[PDB]
Write an enzyme that holds these catalytic residues in place. Sequence first.
Site, PDB file in Angstrom:
ATOM      1  N   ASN A 283      25.529  -4.063  29.803  1.00 14.67           N
ATOM      2  CA  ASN A 283      26.296  -5.225  30.312  1.00 14.67           C
ATOM      3  C   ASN A 283      27.721  -5.201  29.872  1.00 14.67           C
ATOM      4  O   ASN A 283      28.097  -4.500  28.919  1.00 14.67           O
ATOM      5  CB  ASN A 283      25.641  -6.522  29.830  1.00 14.67           C
ATOM      6  CG  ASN A 283      24.193  -6.599  30.226  1.00 14.67           C
ATOM      7  OD1 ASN A 283      23.303  -6.687  29.390  1.00 14.67           O
ATOM      8  ND2 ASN A 283      23.951  -6.501  31.511  1.00 14.67           N
TER       9      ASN A 283
ATOM     10  N   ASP B 218      20.194  -4.230  28.230  1.00 16.58           N
ATOM     11  CA  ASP B 218      18.874  -4.767  28.582  1.00 16.58           C
ATOM     12  C   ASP B 218      17.829  -3.614  28.602  1.00 16.58           C
ATOM     13  O   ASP B 218      18.097  -2.512  29.097  1.00 16.58           O
ATOM     14  CB  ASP B 218      18.940  -5.405  29.985  1.00 16.58           C
ATOM     15  CG  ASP B 218      19.896  -6.592  30.072  1.00 16.58           C
ATOM     16  OD1 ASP B 218      20.109  -7.332  29.109  1.00 16.58           O
ATOM     17  OD2 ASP B 218      20.407  -6.827  31.168  1.00 16.58           O
TER      18      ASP B 218
END
Length: 129
Positions: A46, A52
């Site tokens: 990100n 993630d």
Amino acid sequence: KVFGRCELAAAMKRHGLDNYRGYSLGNWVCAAKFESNFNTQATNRNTDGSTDYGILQINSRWWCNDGRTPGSRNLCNIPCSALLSSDITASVNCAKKIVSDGNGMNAWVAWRNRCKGTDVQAWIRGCRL
Ligand SMILES: [Cl-]
Ligand SMILES: [Cs+]
């Protein structure tokens, strides 16, 4: 490991996700489909420097430690690499903490945008459960 749809449904059921905090099993399958395409090894970086991880794309700023996200809180008390295992136990255990945090499954952006308000039962149709 890349799960089949019904194989994943069965594993999620066995680990107590069906109706966990009121979310039927189809919600969890739909979220996994659009977060990771059912691949336990999925990672995505990100803009904020967090990453993630895994079948449910759990974030390193709040939930797991990856050694490179400054000020991570590591609320699930696990290395993020544990979330890439073929065994989904760590991902499920951490997801139960996430969904209990106040915003329910809205914590998963793909669930909110692609699953919420749709016929999610379709994701478990045809499966022997
Ligand atoms: Cl809720
Ligand atoms: Cs902690």
